[PDB]
């Protein structure tokens, strides 16, 4: 009989990387080295784009207390590409550092900084005891304690209206059930570790299908075509054979999808050229064999493949098992280990597309087109 | 500086249909010979779009006014213009349109397009005067009368100088889609030749993206800037505005819908349906086709 014994696939012979031609340096010093960090209610926003960012320096600086990363490992930040990076900074006590994580409820979390549940990015926190704390006390950092409702994620509230705790309207005047909109921080060296100043910086990444500008430190190789190669275009990776495609891309488009789950085409970042992506090759491997009664010779069929590719598909490296045995394509694949014969017989081991194999006389496995029966004429 | 306008009068507003008008490319992906169902903020089919005449004519003698009221900005705006002499010249966006809060301005003041994001002090009637025939010879001469003071110019874009030259029925259609999400301002546009139309005709055209801007401000209301073909003290004999209000513009509002876009073999959108329009469109969307059998 014929037995489906395994599956075969052509292995990737090379890996290429293509990244944009930006050669700038991101100003990570300014956000981190800034002498004056913002208040809790106001914070700050500093967009970062069109520069390469070496996140290894910040990870191994060892000057930061926390490096908890959400949705991405800190070690792999170098390899990735983002459209832009948002940097926000403020000053928080030691005990309130926990309230910066998503999906948590706390005074800072509810009234000052709400992070979204589906938040990608990292938070950087380190103590600023010798910078933001004074003997007389740094009261320039404010506290929001009482708000009408919980703030939406990534929302800034600056209004200094005197909120109403009771039924009487404050009308912008303090008094009964009317409190100062923004309390002050007691930053003094006498305070404990949980009350010491901590400078907190949050980095939020945008992993969107758009041109990237904050790609990390990496080198770009050359474009090799018409071979099975690992590719990495603007951060998206995969494997396939890439050729020259004639699809008329619109100037604002980057990818191409026909079945909505496979990117059949892509645009090279450096040279704005469009090249399609196709899977390398795969198929099933079947072994045509007579019984261990008759002999031990076998034949192998690589199902549904062009088999100029078979010798380099996938130590058990028989490849072309018997190169002397004339290989020949059928509609089912090409058969290796069998000899083609013009004579037709009744089928005993079916192969497909009218081709049948048998073991006969000296004796060897042969391949032929099946005969439908003896001819007759009434 | 800003100067006032004299004669106002009134005329009740008009409306028009918008059958298959105002479709843009949602994402940046290439599709071929496949119909694909998306979900975004589109202008619903057969919508009621307010109609404004650029020159608010009381009578064809020459009694005029500008019709540029401040309008809301609800989750985006579809804007179309039908004109033949470039009367429309830009828009102003913001919340209060004064010095209290920031406001975006996109004005094509003849020489070059100027995008700014500053705390302008807008007057009640912003307009750009054109002394097309005021001087002895016949040549366009512009005027900038939008705001009074500008501060905190966070963003600024200017274009390379260009001059409009004409040297009267070749009207032009210019569709625009404005959208403001996650602190980004989006502009889509298209241009289409047309001739001798009283209002916007039916048909289909897909609006391609033109720019994505990191303005990141609050937008709730907006206005329109129009070219004043006259002066304000004493323009001339009569018929100050061009052709007594033939220039006009329409405003529609985007809503969360679900369309079934149809891409042809060249990757351009050719037709679409609105799923929540009528039962037949519901059947087409559920069946994922443009034709339904019995």
């Amino acid at each position: 009989g014929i037995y489906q014994t395994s599956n075969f696939r052509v292995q990737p012979t090379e890996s290429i990387v293509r990244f944009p031609n930006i050669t700038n340096l991101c100003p990570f010093g300014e956000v981190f080295n800034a002498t004056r960090f913002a208040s809790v209610y106001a914070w700050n926003r500093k967009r970062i784009s069109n520069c390469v960012a070496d996140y290894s320096v910040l990870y191994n600086s060892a000057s930061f207390s926390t490096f908890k990363c959400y949705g991405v490992s800190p070690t792999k930040l170098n390899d990735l590409c983002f459209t832009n990076v948002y940097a926000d900074s403020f000053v928080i006590r030691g005990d309130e550092v926990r309230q910066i994580a998503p999906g948590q409820t706390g005074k800072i979390a509810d009234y000052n900084y709400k992070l979204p549940d589906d938040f990608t990015g990292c938070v950087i926190a380190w103590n600023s005891n010798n910078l933001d704390s004074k003997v007389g006390g740094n009261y320039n950092y404010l506290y929001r304690l009482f708000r009408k409702s919980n703030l939406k994620p990534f929302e800034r509230d600056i209004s200094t209206e005197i909120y109403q705790a009771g039924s009487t309207p404050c009308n912008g005047v303090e008094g009964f059930n009317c409190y100062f909109p923004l309390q002050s921080y007691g930053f003094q060296p006498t305070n404990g570790v949980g009350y010491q100043p901590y400078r907190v910086v949050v980095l939020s990444f945008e992993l969107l299908h758009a041109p990237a500008t904050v790609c990390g430190p990496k080198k770009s190789t050359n474009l090799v075509k018409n071979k099975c190669v690992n590719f990495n275009f603007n951060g998206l990776t995969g494997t396939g054979v890439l050729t020259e495609s004639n699809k008329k891309f619109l100037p604002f488009q980057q990818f191409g999808r026909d079945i909505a789950d496979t990117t059949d085409a892509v645009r090279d970042p450096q040279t704005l050229e469009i090249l399609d992506i196709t899977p390398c090759s795969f198929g099933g491997v079947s072994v045509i064999t007579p019984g261990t009664n008759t002999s031990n010779q076998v034949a192998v069929l690589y199902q549904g493949v062009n088999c100029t590719e078979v010798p380099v598909a996938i130590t058990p490296t028989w490849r072309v098992y018997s190169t002397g045995s004339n290989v020949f394509q059928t509609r089912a694949g090409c058969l290796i280990g069998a000899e083609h014969v013009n004579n037709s017989y009744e089928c005993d081991i079916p192969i497909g597309a009218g081709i049948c194999a048998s073991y006969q006389t000296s004796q060897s496995i042969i391949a032929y087109t099946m005969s439908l029966g003896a001819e007759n004429s009434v | 500086q800003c100067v006032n306008l004299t004669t106002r009068t009134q005329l009740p507003p008009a409306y028009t249909n918008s059958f298959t008008r105002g479709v843009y490319y949602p994402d940046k992906v290439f599709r071929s010979s496949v119909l694909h169902s998306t979900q975004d903020l589109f202008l619903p089919f057969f919508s009621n779009v307010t109609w404004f005449h650029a020159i608010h004519v009381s009578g064809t003698n020459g009694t005029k006014r500008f019709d540029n009221p401040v309008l809301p900005f609800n989750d985006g705006v579809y804007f179309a213009s039908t004109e033949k002499s470039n009367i429309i010249r830009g828009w102003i966006f913001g919340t209060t349109l004064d010095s209290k809060t920031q406001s975006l301005l996109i004005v094509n003041n003849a020489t070059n397009v100027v995008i700014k994001v500053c705390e302008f002090q807008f007057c009640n009637d912003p307009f750009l005067g054109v002394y097309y025939h005021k001087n002895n010879k016949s040549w366009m001469e512009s005027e900038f009368r939008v705001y009074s003071s500008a501060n905190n110019c966070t963003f600024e874009y200017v274009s390379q100088p260009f001059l409009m030259d004409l040297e009267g029925n070749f009207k032009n259609l210019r569709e625009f889609v404005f959208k403001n999400i996650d602190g980004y301002f989006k502009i889509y546009s298209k241009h289409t030749p047309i001739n001798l139309v009283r209002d916007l005709p039916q048909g289909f055209s897909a609006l391609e993206p033109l720019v994505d801007l990191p303005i990141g401000i609050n937008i709730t209301r907006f206005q329109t800037l129009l070219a004043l073909h006259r002066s304000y003290l004493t323009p001339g004999d009569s018929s100050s505005g061009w052709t007594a209000g033939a220039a006009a513009y329409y405003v529609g509002y985007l809503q969360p819908r679900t369309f079934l876009l149809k891409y042809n073999e060249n990757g351009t959108i050719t037709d679409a349906v609105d799923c929540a329009l009528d039962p037949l469109s519901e059947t087409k969307c559920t069946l994922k086709s443009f034709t339904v059998e019995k």
Epitope: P251 | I106, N108, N112, V113, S159, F162, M164, S189, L210
Partner: nanobody, 117 residues
Framework: VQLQESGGGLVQPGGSLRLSCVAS???????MGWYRQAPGKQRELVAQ???????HYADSVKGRFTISEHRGKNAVYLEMHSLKPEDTAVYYC?????????????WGQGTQVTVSS
């Protein structure tokens, strides 16, 4: 985002460079010209080509640089010859996409073409 441009190249005086500010797709315009900028001075016109075929040239560019366009390719092409160090600058290509009757040029994406021995 629309269009994008890329390229560049260093060169020794007396050489010739062929840079096309390759368009990211078939686009419509009215005057697709070439500009340049070196640190220390304001940005100047180099040469322009319109849809009709008029080729405007700056005062210091006659007889040395010419611009061509490939409609079947959708790319402008400035043929720059007989380079001198004074030509050193970061080179750009503005686009004349019609916006509100013309404007919103796309010269921001440019190339570096420096002439030095």
């Amino acid at each position: 985002v629309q269009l994008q441009e890329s390229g560049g190249g260093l060169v020794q005086p007396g050489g010739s460079l062929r840079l096309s500010c390759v368009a990211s797709g078939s686009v419509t315009f009215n005057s697709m010209g070439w500009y340049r900028q070196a640190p220390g001075k304001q940005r100047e016109l180099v040469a322009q080509i319109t849809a009709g075929g008029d080729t405007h040239y700056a005062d210091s560019v006659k007889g040395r640089f010419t611009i061509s366009e490939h409609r079947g390719k959708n790319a402008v092409y400035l043929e720059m010859h007989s380079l001198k160090p004074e030509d050193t600058a970061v080179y750009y290509c503005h686009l004349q996409v019609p916006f509100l009757g013309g404007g919103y040029d796309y010269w921001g994406q440019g190339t570096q073409v420096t002439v030095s021995s």
